[PDB]
Amino acid sequence: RRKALPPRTEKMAVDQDWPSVYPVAAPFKPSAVPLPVRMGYPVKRGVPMAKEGNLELLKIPNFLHLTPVAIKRHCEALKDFCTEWPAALDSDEKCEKHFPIEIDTADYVSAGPSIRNPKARVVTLRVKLSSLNLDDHAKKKLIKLVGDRYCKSTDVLTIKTDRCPLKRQNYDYAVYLLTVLYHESWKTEEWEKKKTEADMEE
């Protein structure tokens, strides 16, 4: 009947480039790996099983396709698709000076036929109040208006939005809250003069 051909390990060159053999992630093929590798708990007086017909070497997620020789070759080709970070934004303090708004977003990757994660719609917008144009009266009203979202020690304002289904709608809604909270802190309405001496922050 049909016979078994000798494995290609014998015909493998000594100095051949490994990444050409495994371009993508593939399971451990005993014939395609020149390395004699043994794993499995040995018998009372014996040696661990060979690399042919062994399931223990098949369960493991191999890293033969990410060899350090291949990593340098892979990454260097990707260097075209990049742009440098501006040198003037070296210190983190300067980043706040030139960009006072930071926005946190999350993306989730999981194994399955679906990518829809309801936890990926959250948007966290944090603004340092010292970089805005609030007056003495306007800043005091904004703190009294936003409530617990403002930290008195770090002077940071955190706005978290979850109602919009998409991250782009939440991002547009989050920035909408920031601008309407600022245009409202400057409207000294008539009833504001009815301040009580127990409501004063100082």
């Binding site: 742009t83 946190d104 805005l132």
Partner: protein, 138 residues
């Protein structure tokens, strides 16, 4: 000796839209086996160094989930068999990463993700004030 001459054909159209600047990018990989995550960190660090990212790697504390089930299929409630699911963590922080460099690094990282792990990315995009706030409107 015989090789396909010039088998490379990608295009990178440089448009006029300003690129998106990310203050800091956080990657949190979670898995069941430490050895896979230990090797995956080395792959991520080696690729990050070559691109010039200056990343920092730290290990968040692990958490263990336990639950108890009955042993036999009838009576015998004084004998239990327990089980345990272990999720080990590993976080890779990225700082001062541009939007264009972010896209390639993440997709290269995601495609080589092992089957037994998953990850979450927290991107801290930075930008200037809104037009209404910047432009003086009372």
């Amino acid at each position: 000796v015989d090789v396909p001459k010039d088998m490379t054909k990608p295009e990178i159209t440089i448009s006029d839209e300003p690129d998106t600047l990310y203050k800091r990018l956080s990657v949190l990989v979670k898995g069941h086996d430490k050895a896979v995550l230990d090797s995956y960190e080395y792959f991520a660090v080696l690729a990050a160094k070559e691109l010039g990212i200056s990343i920092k790697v730290h290990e968040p504390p692990r958490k263990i989930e336990r639950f108890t089930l009955l042993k036999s299929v009838h009576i015998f409630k004084k004998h239990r068999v327990q089980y345990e699911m272990r999720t080990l963590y590993r976080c890779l922080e990225l700082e001062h990463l541009t939007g264009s460099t972010a896209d390639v690094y993440l997709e290269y990282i995601q495609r080589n993700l092992p089957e037994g792990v998953a990850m979450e990315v927290t991107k801290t995009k930075l930008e200037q004030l809104p037009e209404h706030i910047r432009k003086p409107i009372w």
